[PDB]
Write a protein that binds this ligand. Structure first.
Ligand SMILES: Nc1nc2c(ncn2[C@@H]2O[C@H](COP(=O)(O)OP(=O)(O)NP(=O)(O)O)[C@@H](O)[C@H]2O)c(=O)[nH]1
Ligand SMILES: N[C@@H](Cc1ccccc1)C(=O)O
Ligand SMILES: CSCC[C@H](NC=O)C(=O)O
Ligand SMILES: [Mg+2]
Ligand SMILES: [Mg+2]
Ligand SMILES: [Mg+2]
Ligand SMILES: [Mg+2]
Ligand SMILES: [Mg+2]
Ligand SMILES: [Mg+2]
Ligand SMILES: [Mg+2]
Ligand SMILES: [Mg+2]
Ligand SMILES: [Mg+2]
Ligand SMILES: [Mg+2]
Ligand SMILES: [Mg+2]
Ligand SMILES: [Mg+2]
Ligand SMILES: [Mg+2]
Ligand SMILES: [Mg+2]
Ligand SMILES: [Mg+2]
Ligand SMILES: [Mg+2]
Ligand SMILES: [Mg+2]
Ligand SMILES: [Mg+2]
Ligand SMILES: [Mg+2]
Ligand SMILES: [Mg+2]
Ligand SMILES: [Mg+2]
Ligand SMILES: [Mg+2]
Ligand SMILES: [Mg+2]
Ligand SMILES: [Mg+2]
Ligand SMILES: [Mg+2]
Ligand SMILES: [Mg+2]
Ligand SMILES: [Mg+2]
Ligand SMILES: [Mg+2]
Length: 393
RNA sequence: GGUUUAGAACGUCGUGAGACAGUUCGGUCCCUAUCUGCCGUGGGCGCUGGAGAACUGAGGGGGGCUGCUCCUAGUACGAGA
């Protein structure tokens, strides 16, 4: 909080995806040290990508850590997702804001059960583009074995509905590029080139009014309570009226400073992760899931009609019917929420792999409008995608 | 210290003397080692002229415990932990 962030180069939200203990967080650390050395950005280290007691005694990552590496063309903003099956909830918030992912499959183990689950969540939420990275390579010195894994990833993406063969696969060790090997340093400089070439300039919405889903809340010692997240649409000027909408009720507020990776800003534009400082609000009363909207634009609702597309055994979801009373998790912009289902008159049961509409009464009210996309989940797996039809409350 | 003498008391049984793995407080533990054994340490003669050294080894004894950390490797194993 001192240096002013100069608005140059387009902003892009990137993040690593993949199996547990597969080189996902280590890739993030490899991208910093490579890009910082040659081009001349800020250095950083593997340290702080994940500190705490939880991510040291174990070694695993829980929190979605962020990184800011810069290149001549564009200014990237990383989102290193956790990895585990148990940490899928806080991952989806990191994955929703992420524009273009970096998948991490390993040459030794290959595509594992979570790799299938992570890419499954990427499609239904909103991950337009994806890039593969083989994160072991050196451990198995062979030409035939390493190339057989590349075939299975191309099959995985094409089976689950992506381009597959068009996606640029890259090979390279993360640990070898951490130190200073000339052949392996240049091979991850190549990944930065694939990030620029494949993923296009993202289409923002700098016209329709201000909205910002809160991914994680903070309490800065001195300044006040702060909320982070990607600005979904519109802009934010300093000293402007902002209404916080979502869970509990609704509160008036005013912005008193927006920032971008510990650097000041005047205008917080759309499609970029920013930390908004709020005036006269406590850490407890504001929570994760709520949205920073401009007053009057959006209203919180606890009941709505919605066209739900349930999945089958083949697509990956439920395989049995269910009657009114069923309570799955509904993942809107960031947070999840439970709700009872009231089916329409003339529909006795809901079979798997079927398009229908239904009334859903949620326990917590969330801010929503007509034409909002969500992904239903229940029992550590997906259920179905859909869209909102009508407001009731 | 306990049990198991002589003092005294409580509860209990007994008319009473007294009694009770019922309880309670107090209450002398001797022996210079002949033999066997054992740990040490010598004198005698023997071993075939005597003497001084240096070995050999039959045989005997002693010694044999194990933690943690770190690499191999967060590798096999495992959906993950
Ligand atoms: N030899 C070698 N080891 C690697 C390479 N990349 C990653 N690893 C190893 O893979 C392990 C996993 O590290 P990390 O990336 O933090 O795990 P993750 O992929 O983020 N998943 P999670 O954080 O949920 O546990 C580490 O022990 C690391 O040494 C590589 O290129 N070569
Ligand atoms: N836009 C934020 C992203 C972030 C959120 C939470 C922790 C760290 C970073 C910067 O800083
Ligand atoms: C007067 S009580 C005597 C105790 C007895 N004597 C052992 O020598 C025991 O047994
Ligand atoms: Mg492993
Ligand atoms: Mg990780
Ligand atoms: Mg393995
Ligand atoms: Mg006594
Ligand atoms: Mg006695
Ligand atoms: Mg007496
Ligand atoms: Mg007696
Ligand atoms: Mg008694
Ligand atoms: Mg006395
Ligand atoms: Mg005495
Ligand atoms: Mg005495
Ligand atoms: Mg004497
Ligand atoms: Mg003897
Ligand atoms: Mg002797
Ligand atoms: Mg002799
Ligand atoms: Mg003699
Ligand atoms: Mg003689
Ligand atoms: Mg002799
Ligand atoms: Mg002779
Ligand atoms: Mg002789
Ligand atoms: Mg002699
Ligand atoms: Mg000798
Ligand atoms: Mg000798
Ligand atoms: Mg012995
Ligand atoms: Mg180790
Ligand atoms: Mg582990
Ligand atoms: Mg290893
Ligand atoms: Mg297996």
């Amino acid at each position: 909080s001192k240096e002013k962030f100069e608005r140059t180069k387009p902003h892009v939200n990137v993040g690593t995806i993949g199996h547990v203990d597969h080189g996902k967080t280590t890739l993030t650390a490899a991208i910093t040290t490579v890009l910082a050395k040659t081009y001349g950005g800020a250095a950083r280290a593997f340290n702080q990508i994940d500190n705490a007691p939880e991510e040291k005694a174990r070694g695993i990552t829980i929190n979605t850590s962020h990184v800011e590496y810069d290149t001549p063309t564009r200014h990237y903003a990383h989102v290193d997702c956790p990895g585990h099956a148990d940490y899928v909830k806080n991952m989806i918030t990191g994955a929703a804001q992420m524009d273009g992912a970096i998948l991490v499959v390993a040459a030794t183990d290959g595509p594992m059960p979570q790799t299938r689950e992570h890419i499954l969540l990427g499609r239904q939420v909103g991950v337009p583009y994806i890039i593969v990275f083989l994160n072991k390579c050196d451990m198995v010195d062979d030409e035939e074995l390493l190339e057989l894994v590349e075939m299975e990833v191309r099959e995985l993406l094409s089976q689950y509905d992506f381009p597959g063969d068009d996606t640029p696969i890259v090979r390279g060790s993360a640990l070898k590029a951490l130190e200073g090997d000339a052949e392996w340093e240049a091979k991850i400089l190549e990944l930065a080139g694939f990030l620029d070439s494949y993923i296009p300039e993202p289409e923002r919405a700098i016209d329709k009014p201000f909205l910002l889903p809160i991914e994680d809340v903070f309490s800065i010692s001195g300044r006040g309570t702060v909320v982070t997240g990607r600005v979904e649409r519109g802009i934010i000027k300093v000293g402007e009226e902002v209404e916080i909408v979502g869970i509990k009720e609704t509160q008036k507020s005013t912005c008193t400073g927006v920032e971008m990776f510990r650097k000041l800003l005047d205008e917080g534009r759309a499609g970029e992760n920013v930390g908004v400082l709020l005036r006269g609000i406590k850490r407890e009363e504001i929570e994760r899931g709520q949205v920073l909207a401009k007053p009057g634009t959006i209203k919180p609702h606890t009941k709505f009609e919605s066209e739900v597309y349930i999945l089958s055994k083949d697509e990956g979801g439920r395989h049995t019917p269910f009657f009114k009373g069923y309570r799955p998790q509904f993942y809107f912009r960031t947070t999840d929420v439970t709700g009872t289902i009231e089916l329409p008159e003339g529909v006795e049961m809901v079979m798997p792999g079927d398009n229908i509409k239904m009334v859903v009464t949620l326990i917590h009210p969330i801010a929503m409008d007509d034409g909002l996309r969500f992904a239903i989940r229940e029992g550590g797996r997906t259920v179905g995608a859909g869209v909102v039809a009508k407001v009731l409350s």
